[PDB]
């Protein structure tokens, strides 16, 4: 009838113990321990008669002055043992002063065993038939109690003494009377009643009852339920629209929803975020499932499941392939990332393999002194930065002293949202302010709001951004070669022209870009040629068009190609397909073995 209380851990003083005063059920465990100053008088007027059931375990350790539990927990009927203490549902250990257990209403221990050890005054143990309470007593550990010696004068008879009193059951060959105290017998029901319990007259409780009832064969008159509890009734399964909770009660959607909702921080033992699965309200989705967000319902994963990675102290610095690997498989980062990558090989691919699945970062993202990076595109799936935590100065995205960074993301394809915080950009010499300005637009770090410490003089200062266009004046294919010519480049003061750079890769269709799979330093994504500046040969007809002969090409192969002027103008990406077979020559080879 009363409250459902959470598990408790009561130590030192009895003060917090009164928090149990209205509980009918403890949904968790109950530990009472280390009370060295307590005396019998402290327990004489202390009682919790409302407590019927504990879902996990009961543990009592070093509680001084306590001589019996008959007044503390007179009505405790079931210990379910859903969670156990080292396989035990009941632990009584070093209870100096305990003379008897006296749990005279304890009918069933649903799961787990009993450990009663080193209780120097403890008697009324030989008088308990545990086979009535637990299915297997084989794992019980009841040793080093007063009962082990020749000093227990256990006496059950009191009313008439030895004439029609406690029920007696056999140990091996000896019949023993069965009681909890001098004034309380152990309840024993007919075998037909099984674990359901019976009334004082021996009439069976209903099959949905567990241990005891106030009336026979009525599922609304149970002291406790065998299966589930709902609206003063014991039920086999929870009916619609209810869900099975903590393996003992029926709850509605709204209850499950309230538990779930936003236990702000405390991910590490103080949240779970409850979900719905197979008509159960449970702590988390089982393996192979993920949580559909709008209705708390676990649904099977489309391929591999999303993975939340909680960072130690809310941050992690990635300075190597090895540290990046520690985040492999993550789809959500709870915390903030600091990127500090100075060197290595095949970084764009390696970083994309380990970090390419991250869709969200709850804190901030900081890129600093990452000398090796040319792009942040390896963060392939990153769509959200929440800024729930920020870098000092209230920054959610911060880029400082990245000497080769030319691209953030390709803003023609990528969408990134930044909920809170500002942007910081300083000492990114190869990064054009247009890319930064595009990012502000895309991310919603909107210009109607507050600032972003963005340097005008130290972002892009060592880059000329796209500017002029070089055009191809000549193109020639061979099955193995490509010969190209293109416009000569002349800056304002035409003086000291030094270098062109030709890029070519084997390409399929369309999907080719300059800032592709970070060329960085080492393993490259582009085949590159340095083309010496031409010789003008006067003013009238000075187009001695720089060119190049590509050799070592596969036949019938499409090549992405483009030219650039050494750090003015770049040509557009042209696709050139090497020659293949003449129709005539496909025919021959077919038509003649």
């Amino acid at each position: 009838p009363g409250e459902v209380c959470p598990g408790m851990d009561i130590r030192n003083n009895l003060t917090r113990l009164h928090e149990l005063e209205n509980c009918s059920v403890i949904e968790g465990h109950l530990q009472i321990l280390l009370m060295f100053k307590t005396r019998p008088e402290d327990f004489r007027d202390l009682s919790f008669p409302k407590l019927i059931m504990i879902t996990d375990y009961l543990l009592l350790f070093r509680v001084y002055g306590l001589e019996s539990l008959k007044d503390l927990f007179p009505n405790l009927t079931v210990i379910r043992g859903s969670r156990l203490f080292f396989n035990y549902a009941l632990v009584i250990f070093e209870m100096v002063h305990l003379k008897e257990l006296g749990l005279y209403n304890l009918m069933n221990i649903t799961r787990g065993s009993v450990r009663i050890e080193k209780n120097n005054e403890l008697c009324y143990l030989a008088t308990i038939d545990w086979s009535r309470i637990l299915d297997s007593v084989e794992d019980n550990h009841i040793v080093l109690n007063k009962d082990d010696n020749e000093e227990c004068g256990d006496i059950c008879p009191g009313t008439a003494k030895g004439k029609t009193n406690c029920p007696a059951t056999v140990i091996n060959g000896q019949f023993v009377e069965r009681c909890w105290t001098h004034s309380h017998c152990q309840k024993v029901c007919p075998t037909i009643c099984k674990s359901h319990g019976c009334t004082a007259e021996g009439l069976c409780c209903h099959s949905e009852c567990l241990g005891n009832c106030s009336q026979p064969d009525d599922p609304t008159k149970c002291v406790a339920c065998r299966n589930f509890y709902l609206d003063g009734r014991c039920v086999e399964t929870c009916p619609p629209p209810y869900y099975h909770f903590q393996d003992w009660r029926c709850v509605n959607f709204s209850f499950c929803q309230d538990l779930h909702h936003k236990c702000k921080n405390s991910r590490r033992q103080g949240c779970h975020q409850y979900v719905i699965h197979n008509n159960k309200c449970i702590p988390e989705c089982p393996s192979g499932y993920t949580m559909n967000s709008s209705n708390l319902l676990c649904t099977p994963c489309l391929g591999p499941c999303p993975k939340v990675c909680h960072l130690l102290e809310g941050e992690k610095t990635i300075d190597s392939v090895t540290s990046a690997q520690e985040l492999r498989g993550c789809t959500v980062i709870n915390g903030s990332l600091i990127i500090n990558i100075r060197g290595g090989n095949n970084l764009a691919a390696e970083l994309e393999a380990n970090l390419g699945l991250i869709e969200e970062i709850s804190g901030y993202l900081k890129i600093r002194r990452s000398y090796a990076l040319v792009s942040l595109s390896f963060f392939r799936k990153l769509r959200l930065i929440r800024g729930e935590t920020l870098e000092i100065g209230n920054y959610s995205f911060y880029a400082l002293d990245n000497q080769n960074l030319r691209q953030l993301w390709d803003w023609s394809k990528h969408n990134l949202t930044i909920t809170q915080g500002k942007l910081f950009f300083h000492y990114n010499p190869k990064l054009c302010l247009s890319e930064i300005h595009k990012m502000e637009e895309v991310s919603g770090t909107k210009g109607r709001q507050e600032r972003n410490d963005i340097a005008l003089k130290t972002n892009g200062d060592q880059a000329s951004c796209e500017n002029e266009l070089l055009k191809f004046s000549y193109i020639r294919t061979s099955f193995d070669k490509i010969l190209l010519r293109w416009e000569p480049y002349w800056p304002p003061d035409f003086r000291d022209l030094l270098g062109f750079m030709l890029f070519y890769k084997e390409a399929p269709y369309q999907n080719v870009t300059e800032f592709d799979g970070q060329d960085a330093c080492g393993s490259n994504s582009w085949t590159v040629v340095d083309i010496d500046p031409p010789l003008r040969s006067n003013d009238p007809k000075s187009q001695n068009h720089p060119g190049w002969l590509m050799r070592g090409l596969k036949p019938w192969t499409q090549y992405a190609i483009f030219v650039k002027t050494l750090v003015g103008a770049k040509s557009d990406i042209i696709y050139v397909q090497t020659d293949a077979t003449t129709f005539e020559d496909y025919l021959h080879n077919v038509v003649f073995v």
Binding site: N12, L34, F36, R62, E94, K118
Partner: peptide, 17 residues
Amino acid sequence: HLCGSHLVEALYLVCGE
């Protein structure tokens, strides 16, 4: 030195709560 049931005792010598 320190062990078993004594740790608990050792601790309350020092605790005295």
